[PDB]
Amino acid sequence: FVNQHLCXSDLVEALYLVCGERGFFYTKPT
Amino acid sequence: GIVEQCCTSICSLYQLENYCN
16 A cells, blocks of 8 residues: 555554554564 | 565565564
8 A cells, every 4th residue: 555664653553453453573583 | 584675675564464463
């Protein structure tokens, strides 16, 4: 719907509305 | 990392769903 940068509250925005209110976890490998 | 092309450059929404769990 945009095909742009997906980072912070942006990549988060999606993740939140994308995931499905089931929490998530980006990179931060331990 | 998982949020590669996303947090760095362009990305895809379906990719965001993958992170979910």
